[PDB]
Amino acid sequence: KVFGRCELAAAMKRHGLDNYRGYSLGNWVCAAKFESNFNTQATNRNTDGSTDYGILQINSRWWCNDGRTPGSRNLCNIPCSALLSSDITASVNCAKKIVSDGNGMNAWVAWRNRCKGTDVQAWIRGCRL
Ligand SMILES: [Cl-]
Ligand SMILES: [Cl-]
Ligand SMILES: [Cl-]
Ligand code: NA
Ligand SMILES: [Ru+3]
């Protein structure tokens, strides 16, 4: 599923991501935009052989199991495919664990490089939330 910008904002809020660990909703929407262009099916192989999955491109190196990332962990206790569902619950639940890991949203390199410090509120501007 390819979410619209305000549609994703609303689903993220419903699932408790707005202001989670202090990150406003615009930050999450901006992270999703650059990580997956709002497409729940997005996948990208990393150089190290791990793979990022879903709206927030969660990495199999640590967070989900894909059966093909040697030596990795599955800290969200989920098959990576769950992260590609039209329903974003699994991605959100696992994102909450990632963002609580110590480095906040810097765990998402696109958020640090393209969202951090910017006017992220623009991402939820005009949305009926
Ligand atoms: Cl594996
Ligand atoms: Cl959803
Ligand atoms: Cl933080
Ligand atoms: Na893994
Ligand atoms: Ru839902």
Curated annotation (Swiss-Prot):
Gene3D superfamilies: 1.10.530.10. Residues 1-129 form the C-type lysozyme domain. It is found in: Secreted. It catalyses: Hydrolysis of (1->4)-beta-linkages between N-acetylmuramic acid and N-acetyl-D-glucosamine residues in a peptidoglycan and between N-acetyl-D-glucosamine residues in chitodextrins. SUPFAM superfamilies: Lysozyme-like (SSF53955). PROSITE patterns: GLYCOSYL_HYDROL_F22_1 (PS00128), GLYCOSYL_HYDROL_F22_2 (PS51348). One of its GO terms (biological process) is defense response to Gram-negative bacterium. Keywords: Allergen, Antimicrobial, Bacteriolytic enzyme, Disulfide bond, Glycosidase, Hydrolase, Secreted, Signal. It comes from the Eukaryota. One of its GO terms (molecular function) is beta-N-acetylglucosaminidase activity. GO terms for cellular component: cytoplasm; endoplasmic reticulum; extracellular space. Substrate binds at residue 101. Disulfide bonds join 6-127, 30-115, 64-80, 76-94. It is an enzyme of class 3 (hydrolase). It holds the Pfam family Lys. The active site is at 35, 52. InterPro entries: Glyco_hydro_22, Glyco_hydro_22_CS, Glyco_hydro_22_lys, Lysozyme-like_dom_sf. In the egg white and polymorphonuclear leukocytes. Its EC number is 3.2.1.17. Lysozymes have primarily a bacteriolytic function; those in tissues and body fluids are associated with the monocyte-macrophage system and enhance the activity of immunoagents. Has bacteriolytic activity against M.luteus. Lysozyme C is capable of both hydrolysis and transglycosylation; it also shows a slight esterase activity. It acts rapidly on both peptide-substituted and unsubstituted peptidoglycan, and slowly on chitin oligosaccharides. Belongs to the glycosyl hydrolase 22 family. Monomer. This is Lysozyme C. It comes from Gallus gallus (Chicken). The gene is LYZ.
